[PDB]
Design a binder for this molecule. Structure first.
Ligand SMILES: [Zn+2]
Ligand SMILES: [Zn+2]
Lengths: 72, 62, 148
């Protein structure tokens, strides 16, 4: 499925993902598209911080869902 | 200030929303597009770049 | 300036930012108060932390003074409530809103940063004796953000 990742400023990127993808894999794809290392990324969905190692299906992330990205 | 003048300033079409003031573009507004493809109000990006040198969205320097 | 603040307030009215609420105190639109719910993973779970938000007259071109009025045991928050956060100083951008700042603060509550701390003692305790950190933080939350 495709998802959206929006930074706080408003930088909107579209990601190609599998529901079985871990959050670290999503951060790796974010680095592929935008070029920010994953250790500096913090992903949030539904007001909940996403743990590294958890899958998209753990959080019920579905089609056209929007994550929020916090830099560091 | 002349560095601000030497920027991709164009006339008004599309509406969208300027990320700074969070307002829809209308007639009479003049848009300014940065090399980082980000477009803003001329007024807003001018008052921003007067004391900073980064794009408000992706933080690329201008 | 003022219309930007009113627009942010209306957008908060339309879209409540989950574990965060914010709004003006009295007839002063430039002084806001906010409440943040402690992250459920964090030892701050169950607590409600208050914050004062002072907007400058040239907002959003200057970041607001955001400070914790509720005491909290966090390495990035001192007793004066000041927050060592990137976007409240050097990394500020006029594209940011109060909702996004509150999201950042909730993320900081979930995932602290002890390597660039504001209270070095709590940073030492956090990186060397995590049991003591979590214990003192949980009892701080229960003593200053619960009961009443
Ligand atoms: Zn504008
Ligand atoms: Zn840019």
């Amino acid at each position: 499925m495709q998802i959206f990742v929006k930074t706080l400023t408003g930088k909107t990127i579209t990601l190609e993902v599998e529901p079985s993808d871990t959050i670290e894999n999503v951060k790796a794809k974010i680095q592929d598209k935008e070029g920010i290392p994953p250790d500096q990324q913090r992903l949030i969905f539904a007001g909940k911080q996403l743990e590294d190692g958890r899958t998209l299906s753990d959080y019920n992330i579905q089609k056209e869902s929007t994550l929020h990205l916090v830099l560091r | 200030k002349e560095q601000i003048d030497n920027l991709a300033m164009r006339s008004f079409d599309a509406l969208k929303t300027c990320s700074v003031c969070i307002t829809e573009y209308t007639e009479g507004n003049k848009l300014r597009k940065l090399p980082c493809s980000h477009e803003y109000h001329v007024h807003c990006i001018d008052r921003w770049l007067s004391e900073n040198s980064t794009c408000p969205i992706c933080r690329r320097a201008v | 300036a003022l219309k930007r603040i009113h627009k942010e307030l209306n957008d908060l009215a339309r879209d409540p930012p989950a574990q965060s609420r914010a709004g003006p105190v009295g007839d002063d639109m430039f002084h806001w108060q906010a409440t943040i719910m402690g992250p459920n993973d964090s030892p701050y779970q169950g607590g409600v932390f208050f914050l004062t938000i002072h907007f400058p007259t040239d907002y959003p071109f200057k970041p607001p003074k955001v400070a914790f009025t509720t005491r909290i045991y966090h390495p990035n928050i001192n007793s004066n409530g000041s927050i060592k956060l990137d976007i409240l100083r050097s990394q500020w951008s006029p594209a940011l809103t109060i909702s996004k700042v509150l999201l950042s603060i909730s993320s900081l509550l979930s995932d602290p940063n002890p390597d660039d701390p504001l209270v070095p003692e709590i940073a030492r305790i956090y990186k060397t004796d995590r049991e003591k950190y979590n214990r003192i933080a949980r009892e701080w939350t229960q003593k200053y953000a619960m009961l009443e």
